[PDB]
């Protein structure tokens, strides 16, 4: 963000959520194929959630979940519980249902960020690679 | 063929390079043909003349390349110039493809040049003149009930006037 400054394709804005949004707009501002439900200000919600998870800003993730009211499905409560539980306690039955849904449907979408987010939520396999093998 | 080529060089020159090369290939000359080729700028034919003189391996390779091209279906876009010069190099007068494409080089000009081409490029050089003339007769006559793919020897003053002939 400091390298990209402020006046360069929506630069960094003070605040954790604003900084994550600015980093997402710097990386990939265009809508990535494979979008579900709506978006937050025209930004990829799945990529935003993945960036929040990778950064570790749980408060920014909570803010994103609170902002995404009608722009997501019925998993906002599950996201909030997963963020608020440090030991990851979001009901074993719900976790098994999410894992089954990921193993059934979420296995070939064009959204690597959404796939990784759903895999992390459902706790499937041990390693799930999509497009991170590139000197990162 | 010396007199024929020396009266034909005056009819086709620089601008008539395609027909000049066609006449040179139908005649079977080397000296003045390669001289004119190297004077104009034709190095491919000058280098390939020695490979054509003997050794049918290059001819078989070119035939295999033509078969591969016909299988890949690129002869519809490839002009007939390269196909007909490859046919003249191999020795066949007419080539039939798998896409109803008949490329003819018109070898029915002079029977002497036709027999020379059939003995040099078509039939291998290890074939006697008897077998060569037998193959020529089977070509311009019939082998299994088909069509003649050559010409019939006629007097030179008789070739001037047309006669009711067909491909039967």
């Amino acid at each position: 963000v400091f390298a990209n400054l402020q006046q360069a394709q929506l630069g960094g804005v003070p605040g954790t959520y604003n900084l994550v949004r600015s980093f997402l707009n710097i990386r990939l501002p265009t809508p990535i194929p494979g979008l579900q439900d709506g978006e937050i200000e025209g930004y990829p919600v799945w990529a935003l959630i993945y960036y929040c998870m990778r950064c570790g800003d749980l408060m920014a993730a909570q803010q994103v979940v609170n902002r995404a009211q009608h722009q997501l499905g019925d998993f906002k409560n599950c996201f909030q519980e997963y963020i608020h539980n440090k030991d990851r306690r979001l009901s074993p039955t719900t976790e098994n249902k999410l894992r089954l849904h990921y193993r059934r449907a979420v296995r070939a979408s064009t959204d690597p960020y959404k796939r990784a987010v759903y895999c992390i939520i459902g706790r499937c396999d041990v390693s799930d690679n999509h497009s991170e093998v590139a000197d990162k | 063929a010396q007199e024929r080529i020396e009266e034909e060089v005056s009819l086709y020159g620089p601008e008539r390079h395609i027909e000049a090369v066609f006449s040179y290939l139908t005649g079977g000359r080397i000296s003045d043909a390669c001289r004119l080729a190297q004077k104009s700028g034709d190095h491919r034919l000058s280098l390939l003349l020695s490979q054509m003189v003997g050794s049918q391996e290059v001819r078989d390779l070119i035939t295999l390349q033509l078969v591969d091209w016909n299988k890949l279906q690129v002869d519809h876009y490839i002009q007939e110039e390269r196909l007909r010069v490859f046919c003249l190099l191999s020795g066949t007068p007419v080539w039939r493809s798998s896409d109803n494409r008949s490329i003819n080089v018109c070898s029915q000009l002079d029977w002497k040049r036709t027999l020379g081409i059939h003995l040099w490029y078509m039939l291998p050089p290890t074939a006697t003149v008897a077998q060569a003339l037998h193959m020529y007769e089977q070509a311009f006559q019939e082998q299994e009930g088909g069509e003649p793919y050559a010409c019939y020897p006629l007097p030179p003053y008789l070739e001037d006037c047309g006669f009711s002939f067909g491909d039967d």
């Binding site: 296995r107 | 002939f165 491909d167």
Partner: protein, 756 residues
């Protein structure tokens, strides 16, 4: 057109101005006529071609061009005259016949010459609806008699050569237009129309005719209507299969949607206590639809789009469903046996394909099918796969399986004992399909279970080949099962080599095996020609005409198959062929077949022997100069492998000796060979001799011979066990683990204590 009209006009004008020669104009009038026709000068082209014809009355192409120019202009009389003259000067010409027919049809002056040219064009190539429409426009001048003559000519052409599928389709369309539904149904229900059910358009026309018949005559519903509906649905399934085998996706998806709607309607009509052949037919068609969906999923995955490694789950589920779908047990209800046979054949083919695909995609995992059944057996997964297949179309109300309930239905495990019978049944249909044979060979090679090639050929060709079982011959009119198996192994190895090269060139993430429609053709033009020539020689001689070329190709291929003329070949492929022949001989028990296999292997080894010395001297490796084979550097032999090749040749010689009968010679050869396989074969020969001695009478005298043979074999068994204990690589080098060795040792130590 390739050249510009104005450019070629300027060129011909400059050529005429630089040297205005009437002699050259007359001598090149044909080319001048072509140039003028390209540059739009009909009168000039006509004058040039007339001068060319006057100076030389040869080559009917000039008359053909003159007739074409006259037809383009308007003088139809002179056009058809020149066309008839050219067609009479030439033997035959499809374009000339079509032009004469269309000119006569436009002139409305029907003659016998036009009918003769049309008959000649039909004898040449009776395809395309052009011939049918020309015959119709020619015979419409009569009416009922004209239509009768048209039908008679169509029947005669169909009896002469079975290639009038489009003609029959257009005749059925004309009948539908003229309101002849009964005649169309009678023509479609002909017994000769079963072999012509390989055209998408023809099958769609048959389906439309059956639908029109059902919509018209609905007051009755019996065996005739049942057979009509069964044939309609079979033609729809054939359309689906052909559209999937084609290179298009839109028509395949449309056919799949139509088949799904038809299956849903059939299920809705059957749901009401029905116990007949309809249920078995519905199950077979459901299995076929599952196989079709799996093939579509595999095709859409193998396109560099979605995850090919993750798209295996729905394809594997569909293949497992098609495999667990059973086969029609004989005939449930008598009457539809003519369709029941084709249904059973299609079910066998589908089961074999599904089993092969499952065993090649499971990567040796047995719990994969169980995990697939556990993770894909609910309405949610059903809707997900339906939306992924039909592209967000055909929901539960449109699908036949969405209306029911899924409660984790058990499936069937693919077994080799059943796959062998499936392949044996599918070979009868694959008789003459070199691509299918190569695909089956590649599948079995990847599965590491090679069925007997002798039984393969016996199931493929029901008759005995002409002059079979030939060791060394020089006549092309005498093929043999040995050479057939050698060529099959060679083409399988070269296909595997090409696939491995393509996988190494692209990416190592490619699947283990690919279907036949994805692999396209697995042979070459020369290979297909040789296969057709072999099929002709099996079906008794070749066709008149190209028989000389077929025999020449057969001889040229046999010169390299029988190792007659050494032209240059790699030793690795020949060693692989020899090993395959040895395995095929060991799998069987016939003495003559084993002797022939051993003789062929010994001949191959003696032909390779002069090539092994070139590798030790550090020379060049030969390569196949013929375009038939495609073997490269994937199957190579290093300098350190010459000793192994010589040891294998000695083992082959010893096995030849043992099969012939010189047991002492085989034993001394194995003793001279310093290999562990030699000691294993010595122990096997000792055990065989002990068994042959024990098979006879066992009084009180042969016991000493049995005991000494048991001791002789136990010595070699103990030395093999000692070698294995000293170095663990002995068990890996031996084709059999130490388990059988210990079992034989225990059997020998138990039988040594016997006293008859």
């Amino acid at each position: 057109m390739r050249r510009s009209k104005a450019e070629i006009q300027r060129y011909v004008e400059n050529a005429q101005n630089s040297a205005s020669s009437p002699r050259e104009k007359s001598m090149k009038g044909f080319l001048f006529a072509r140039l003028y026709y390209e540059a739009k000068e009909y009168e000039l082209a006509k004058r040039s071609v007339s001068s060319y014809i006057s100076v030389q009355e040869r080559d009917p192409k000039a008359h053909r061009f003159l007739g074409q120019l006259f037809e383009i202009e308007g003088n139809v009389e002179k056009a058809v005259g020149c066309y008839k003259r050219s067609l009479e000067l030439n033997p035959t010409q499809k374009d000339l016949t079509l032009r004469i027919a269309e000119l006569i049809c436009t002139l409305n002056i029907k003659d016998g010459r036009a009918e003769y040219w049309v008959e000649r064009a039909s004898k040449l190539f009776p395809g395309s609806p052009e011939i049918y429409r020309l015959k119709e426009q020619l015979l419409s001048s009569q009416g009922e008699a004209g239509w009768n003559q048209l039908f008679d000519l169509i029947q005669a052409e169909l009896f002469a050569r079975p290639n009038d599928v489009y003609v029959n389709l257009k005749l059925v369309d004309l009948f539908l237009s003229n309101q002849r539904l009964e005649e169309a149904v009678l023509h479609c229900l002909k017994p000769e129309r079963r072999a012509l059910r390989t055209d998408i358009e023809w099958c769609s026309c048959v389906v439309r005719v059956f639908k029109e018949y059902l919509a018209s005559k609905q007051g009755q519903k019996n065996t005739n209507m049942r057979m009509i509906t069964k044939e309609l649905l079979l033609a729809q399934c054939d359309v689906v299969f052909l559209t999937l085998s084609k290179k298009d996706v839109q028509k395949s998806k449309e056919a799949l949607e139509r088949f799904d709607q038809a299956l849903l309607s059939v299920k809705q009509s059957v749901s009401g206590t029905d116990a007949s052949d309809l249920s078995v037919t519905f199950y077979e068609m459901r299995g076929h639809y599952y196989m079709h969906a799996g093939t579509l999923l595999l095709k859409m995955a193998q396109s560099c789009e979605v995850q090919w490694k993750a798209l295996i789950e729905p394809a594997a589920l569909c293949y497992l469903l098609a495999y667990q779908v059973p086969k029609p047990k004989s005939k449930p209800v008598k009457g539809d046996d003519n369709g029941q046979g084709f249904l059973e054949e299609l079910a066998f083919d589908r089961q074999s394909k599904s089993g092969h695909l499952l065993l090649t995609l499971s990567h040796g995992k047995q719990n994969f099918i169980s995990e697939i059944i556990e993770t894909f057996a609910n309405q949610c997964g059903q809707s997900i796969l339906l939306k992924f297949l039909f592209e967000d179309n055909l929901s539960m109300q449109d699908s036949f399986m969405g209306s029911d309930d899924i409660s984790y239905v058990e499936n069937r495990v693919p077994d080799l004992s059943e796959l062998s019978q499936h392949d044996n049944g599918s070979l009868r249909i694959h008789n003459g399909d070199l691509q299918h044979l190569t695909w089956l060979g590649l599948q079995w090679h990847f599965l590491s279970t090679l069925p007997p090639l002798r039984k393969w050929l016996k199931q493929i060709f029901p008759r005995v080949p002409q002059e079979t079982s030939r060791l060394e011959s020089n006549i092309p009119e005498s093929i043999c099962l040995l050479d057939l198996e050698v060529f099959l192994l060679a083409v399988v190895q070269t296909s595997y080599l090409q696939l491995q090269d393509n996988n190494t060139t692209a990416d190592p993430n490619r699947p283990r095996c690919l279907p036949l429609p994805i692999c396209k053709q697995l042979f070459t033009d020369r290979q297909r020609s040789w296969w057709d020539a072999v099929y002709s020689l099996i079906t008794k001689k070749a066709l008149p005409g190209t028989s000389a070329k077929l025999r020449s190709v057969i001889q040229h291929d046999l010169t390299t198959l029988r190792a007659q003329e050494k032209h240059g070949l790699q030793p690795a492929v020949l060693v692989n062929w020899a090993r395959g022949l040895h395995k095929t001989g060991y799998s069987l028990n016939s003495f003559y077949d084993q002797k022939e296999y051993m003789g062929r292997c010994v001949h191959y080894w003696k032909k390779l022997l002069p090539l092994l010395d070139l590798v030790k001297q550090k020379k060049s490796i030969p390569e196949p100069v013929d375009p038939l084979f495609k073997h490269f550097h994937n199957k190579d032999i290093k300098v350190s492998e010459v000793k192994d090749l010589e040891d294998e040749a000695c083992i082959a010689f010893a096995t030849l000796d043992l099969v012939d009968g010189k047991t002492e010679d085989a034993i001394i050869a194995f003793e001279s060979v310093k290999n562990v396989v030699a000691y294993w074969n010595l122990a096997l020969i000792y055990q065989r001799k002990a068994e042959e001695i024990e098979n006879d009478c066992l009084p009180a005298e042969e016991q000493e011979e049995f005991q000494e043979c048991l001791l002789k074999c136990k010595g070699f068994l103990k030395m093999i066990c000692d070698e294995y204990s000293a170095y663990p690589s002995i068990a890996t080098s031996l084709p059999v683990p130490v388990e059988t060795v210990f079992e034989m040792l225990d059997s020998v130590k138990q039988s040594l204590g016997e006293a008859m």
